[PDB]
Design a protein around this motif. Structure first.
Motif, PDB file in Angstrom:
ATOM      1  N   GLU A  97       0.816  -1.207   0.000  1.00 25.82           N
ATOM      2  CA  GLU A  97       0.000   0.000   0.000  1.00 25.82           C
ATOM      3  C   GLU A  97       0.851   1.260   0.000  1.00 25.82           C
ATOM      4  OE1 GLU A  97      -3.587   1.184   0.528  1.00 25.82           O
ATOM      5  OE2 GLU A  97      -3.825  -0.494  -0.855  1.00 25.82           O
ATOM      6  N   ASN A  98       1.560   1.484  -1.104  1.00 31.04           N
ATOM      7  CA  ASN A  98       2.228   2.749  -1.402  1.00 31.04           C
ATOM      8  C   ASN A  98       3.353   3.063  -0.419  1.00 31.04           C
ATOM      9  OD1 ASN A  98       2.526   4.834  -3.210  1.00 31.04           O
ATOM     10  ND2 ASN A  98       1.141   6.211  -2.117  1.00 31.04           N
ATOM     11  N   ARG A  99       4.159   2.065  -0.094  1.00 31.53           N
ATOM     12  CA  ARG A  99       5.304   2.239   0.784  1.00 31.53           C
ATOM     13  C   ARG A  99       6.571   2.450  -0.036  1.00 31.53           C
ATOM     14  NH1 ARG A  99       3.396   3.933   4.886  1.00 31.53           N
ATOM     15  NH2 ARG A  99       4.821   2.913   6.345  1.00 31.53           N
ATOM     16  N   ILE A 100       7.627   2.894   0.636  1.00 32.72           N
ATOM     17  CA  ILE A 100       8.798   3.456  -0.025  1.00 32.72           C
ATOM     18  C   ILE A 100      10.050   2.719   0.427  1.00 32.72           C
ATOM     19  CG2 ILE A 100      10.235   5.513  -0.193  1.00 32.72           C
ATOM     20  CD1 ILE A 100       7.912   5.765  -1.909  1.00 32.72           C
ATOM     21  N   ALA A 101      10.982   2.526  -0.503  1.00 30.60           N
ATOM     22  CA  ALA A 101      12.301   1.995  -0.195  1.00 30.60           C
ATOM     23  C   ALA A 101      13.303   2.601  -1.160  1.00 30.60           C
ATOM     24  CB  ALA A 101      12.340   0.469  -0.281  1.00 30.60           C
ATOM     25  N   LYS A 102      14.558   2.649  -0.735  1.00 30.47           N
ATOM     26  CA  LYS A 102      15.641   3.162  -1.558  1.00 30.47           C
ATOM     27  C   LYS A 102      16.497   2.017  -2.073  1.00 30.47           C
ATOM     28  CE  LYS A 102      18.940   6.735  -2.145  1.00 30.47           C
ATOM     29  NZ  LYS A 102      19.596   7.962  -1.621  1.00 30.47           N
ATOM     30  N   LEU A 103      16.866   2.081  -3.345  1.00 32.84           N
ATOM     31  CA  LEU A 103      17.801   1.133  -3.930  1.00 32.84           C
ATOM     32  C   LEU A 103      19.201   1.724  -3.924  1.00 32.84           C
ATOM     33  CD1 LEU A 103      15.951  -0.214  -7.073  1.00 32.84           C
ATOM     34  CD2 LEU A 103      15.890  -1.088  -4.773  1.00 32.84           C
ATOM     35  N   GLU A 104      20.192   0.889  -3.638  1.00 28.84           N
ATOM     36  CA  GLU A 104      21.573   1.305  -3.821  1.00 28.84           C
ATOM     37  C   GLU A 104      22.375   0.142  -4.387  1.00 28.84           C
ATOM     38  OE1 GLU A 104      24.785   1.112  -2.457  1.00 28.84           O
ATOM     39  OE2 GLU A 104      24.502  -0.668  -1.212  1.00 28.84           O
TER      40      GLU A 104
END
Length: 304
Positions: free
Chosen positions: A182-189
């Motif tokens: 439900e529209n959650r966020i994560a960062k890729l590195e």
RNA sequence: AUUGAAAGUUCAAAGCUUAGAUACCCUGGAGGGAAACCAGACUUAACAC
């Protein structure tokens, strides 16, 4: 090379229907990671009714997912309805412990899944209830009360995957993505990391769900001990396709965190005609059949 | 091209009601208006001789 997915906030990987709250998985399925990566790499011209074809074209072979907590690496391990995260230093003696003696078996395995289990030190299950309000009454709109059990993180956590192609690993760096439900966020590195490939050991760890071609289902099942030493076998859906807005498929799979015996490899290699061979080669390309050696961090696909 | 997309735990709701800083309680006990002290001191003046 290596991709760390760092969730900025509690995540939601909805599993097994919606019908107190809907539960989240611990490790996201490879379809979710592949779908997020394809969402980044998308171009609105390669559309086709085969979601996984247009997805295999957008990326390369992705290797399964595990946990990097704080330099440590955690790995899923299940005994059957019992998931846990363990550091590989406790997977070493596992095959020895597998056909070890009976009371020693339970002593060791229940010491692993309970005290050596680093799950709850890492994961909290956070129920979130939301409602909907109609913009004229300012009271709860009728029938709009939903609940979901999100996956909150007590300490900083990363999901670790390995991608072969290095061209995409440039336009993946530092991307903020809509990872999960439900529209959650994560960062890729992205970082260069060294990982061995394709070791010929007897016991592998299913880092991802090993699919079963639905043709050898009876064959694989009626003698199950021959292939998995410990873990869970379950019918899983493959997710939800963004293009056509439907569920994807349903396949019996060896849930990630299972202990597979070397024989399974040859078995899967003998029960696939060209058609479903290509199908499941695509499946493995997006990341389903990933194995790791209980020896060390060394991955391999089953078919590829 | 992610078991996805979309969805405000929101609305109504007085920490109020009853409730005596009251009851018992001697400014009392002890403590000499005393101590000291002479009703006393001394004659003078005038003229006569």
């Amino acid at each position: 090379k290596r991709v760390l997915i760092k969730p900025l906030e509690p995540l939601m990987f909805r599993s097994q229907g919606e019908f107190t709250a809907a539960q989240s998985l611990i490790i996201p399925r490879p379809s979710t990671i592949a779908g997020m990566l394809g969402y980044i790499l998308f171009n609105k011209s390669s559309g086709t009714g085969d979601w996984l074809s247009d997805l295999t074209n957008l990326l390369a072979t992705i290797y399964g997912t595990f946990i990097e907590t704080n330099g440590e690496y955690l790995f899923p391990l299940r005994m059957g309805n019992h998931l846990a995260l363990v550091d590989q230093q406790h997977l070493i003696n596992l095959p020895t412990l597998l056909e070890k003696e009976y009371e020693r078996r339970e002593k060791g395995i229940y010491e692993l899944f309970y005290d050596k289990n680093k799950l709850f030190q890492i994961i909290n299950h956070q129920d979130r209830i939301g409602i909907s309000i109609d913009k004229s009454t300012r009271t709860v709109k009728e029938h709009y009360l939903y609940s979901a059990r999100y996956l909150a993180f007590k300490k900083e956590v990363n999901y670790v995957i390995f991608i072969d192609n290095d061209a995409i690993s440039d336009k993946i760096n530092g991307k903020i993505v809509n990872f999960g439900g439900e529209n959650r966020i994560a960062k890729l590195e992205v970082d260069d990391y060294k990982v061995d490939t394709s070791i010929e050991e007897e016991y592998y760890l299913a880092l991802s769900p090993i699919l079963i071609p639905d043709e050898a289902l009876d064959n694989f099942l009626d003698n199950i001990s021959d292939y998995v030493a410990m873990g869970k076998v379950d019918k899983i859906s493959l997710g939800f396709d963004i293009a056509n807005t439907k569920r994807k498929e349903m396949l019996t799979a060896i849930l990630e965190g299972s202990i597979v015996k070397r024989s399974i490899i040859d078995f899967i290699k003998n029960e696939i005609k060209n058609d479903l061979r290509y199908r499941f080669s695509k499946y493995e390309k997006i990341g389903y059949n990933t194995l790791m050696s209980l020896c060390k961090l060394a991955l391999r696909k089953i078919l590829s």
